[PDB]
Amino acid sequence: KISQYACQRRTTLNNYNQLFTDALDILAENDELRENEGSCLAFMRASSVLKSLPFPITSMKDTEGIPCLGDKVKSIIEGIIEDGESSEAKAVLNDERYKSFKLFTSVFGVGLKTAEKWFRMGFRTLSKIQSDKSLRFTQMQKAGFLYYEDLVSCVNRPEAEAVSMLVKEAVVTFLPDALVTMTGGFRRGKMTGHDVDFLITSPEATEDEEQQLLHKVTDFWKQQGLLLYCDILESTFEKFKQPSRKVDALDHFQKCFLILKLDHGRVHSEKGKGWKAIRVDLVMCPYDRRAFALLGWTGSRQFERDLRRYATHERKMMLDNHALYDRTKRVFLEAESEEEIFAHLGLDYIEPWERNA
Numbered sequence: 558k559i560s561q562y563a564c565q566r567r568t569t570l571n572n573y574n575q576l577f578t579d580a581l582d583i584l585a586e587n588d589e590l591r592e593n594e595g596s597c598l599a600f601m602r603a604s605s606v607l608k609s610l611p612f613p614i615t616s617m618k619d620t621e622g623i624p625c626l627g628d629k630v631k632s633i634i635e636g637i638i639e640d641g642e643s644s645e646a647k648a649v650l651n652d653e654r655y656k657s658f659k660l661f662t663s664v665f666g667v668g669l670k671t672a673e674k675w676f677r678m679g680f681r682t683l684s685k686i687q688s689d690k691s692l693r694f695t696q697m698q699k700a701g702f703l704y705y706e707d708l709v710s711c712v713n714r715p716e717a718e719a720v721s722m723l724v725k726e727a728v729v730t731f732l733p734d735a736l737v738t739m740t741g742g743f744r745r746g747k748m749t750g751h752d753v754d755f756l757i758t759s760p761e762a763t764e765d766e767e768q769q770l771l772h773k774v775t776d777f778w779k780q781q782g783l784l785l786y787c788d789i790l791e792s793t794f795e796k797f798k799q800p801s802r803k804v805d806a807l808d809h810f811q812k813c814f815l816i817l818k819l820d821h822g823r824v825h826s827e828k829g830k831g832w833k834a835i836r837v838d839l840v841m842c843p844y845d846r847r848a849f850a851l852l853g854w855t856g857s858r859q860f861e862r863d864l865r866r867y868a869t870h871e872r873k874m875m876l877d878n879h880a881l882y883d884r885t886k887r888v889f890l891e892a893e894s895e896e897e898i899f900a901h902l903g904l905d906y907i908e909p910w911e912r913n914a
């Protein structure tokens with residue numbers, strides 16, 4: 558029987574139901590934009606469970622026994638079976654508010670509030686936003702507009718690997734024992750991504766050395782002429798705090814959101830200016846919390862949400878990116894690997910490429 562939890566399902570990139578899930582993902586995204594959190598969650602859980610199927614839905618009978626498929630979702634599936642299209646998702650794709658929110662938030666530095674502001678000012682195109690002489694932009698948005706075309710072309714694996722080399726070269730210059738791991742979508746087997754994320758940890762670094770690494774690495778890149786954008790968020794990590802109770806848990810580790818200059822010569826692929834702007838995120842965590850951070854930063858977002866929901870509701874455990882706490886035993890559970898976290902939770906291990914929920 559298919560579990561309602563993504564953490565009890567294997568979700569690989571061979572999606573046989575893309576016709577259904579692309580429509581459900583559009584409807585979920587629109588509900589996010591329309592601030593309808595409930596309808597958003599229902600469409601996300603339905604899309605997620607269909608992504609896990611080893612076969613394509615070809616009739617309504619095929620949906621029997623599948624959880625997270627409410628009556629509204631079943632009407633959408635029925636419509637796609639009928640003529641290969643979702644009339645509901647088609648209407649969202651042609652909606653002016655939806656088109657504007659997608660287009661405006663595609664700019665690095667633009668969120669829901671700024672996209673809503675620009676829409677209510679009557680803006681519909683990025684050309685009209687950029688050329689407006691009254692608008693004031695944040696430093697993040699200026700970088701978002703300046704490197705727009707590069708950031709909107711999604712990063713491929715040769716580029717992600719070339720970025721990994723740059724990150725490792727910079728990091729070991731200051732911490733030679735540091736462990737650097739590529740996380741996010743690329744770790745889950747994806748061919749492309751909007752950014753490249755890394756988890757950095759050191760078994761022998763001090764609390765101060767751990768704090769200074771992201772500043773040293775970004776200053777080195779600034780000197781090199783490779784740092785196009787940099788925002789370092791200092792740690793708010795608390796060694797003895799209980800893990801988050803929130804639906805979507807916040808990460809308190811030291812991190813940085815960057816834009817790097819990636820020279821074409823560094824990319825070893827099959828194939829203008831000779832460089833590409835790449836979004837890069839670096840996370841530094843204490844060595845003892847590396848398994849929890851890796852598990853949280855690997856994703857997918859739906860896999861993480863269901864992991865934390867399963868931990869709470871089924872095991873009376875509290876899980877987040879920093880720790881795992883057992884409310885019955887009144888102890889924090891230690892882990893040196895993701896496999897140990899899954900074993901603590903009573904879950905069969907799900908490989909990173911199986912977490913595409």
Ligand SMILES: Nc1ncnc2c1ncn2[C@@H]1O[C@H](COP(=O)(O)CP(=O)(O)OP(=O)(O)O)[C@@H](O)[C@H]1O
Pocket residue numbers: 740741742743749750751752753754806807808853854855856857858861878
């Ligand atoms: N501030 C944050 N706190 C905790 N976890 C975060 C986070 N930002 C990102 N993540 C997590 O790390 C994974 C990577 O984040 P993102 O790069 O934003 C999406 P992705 O899974 O890598 O596909 P994508 O890079 O093409 O968008 C997420 O899927 C999520 O699990």
Ligand SMILES: [Mg+2]
Pocket residue numbers: 740741742750751752753754
């Ligand atoms: Mg990512």
Ligand code: NA
Pocket residue numbers: 661662663664665666667668
């Ligand atoms: Na954005």
Ligand SMILES: [Zn+2]
Pocket residue numbers: 741752753754838
């Ligand atoms: Zn990221």
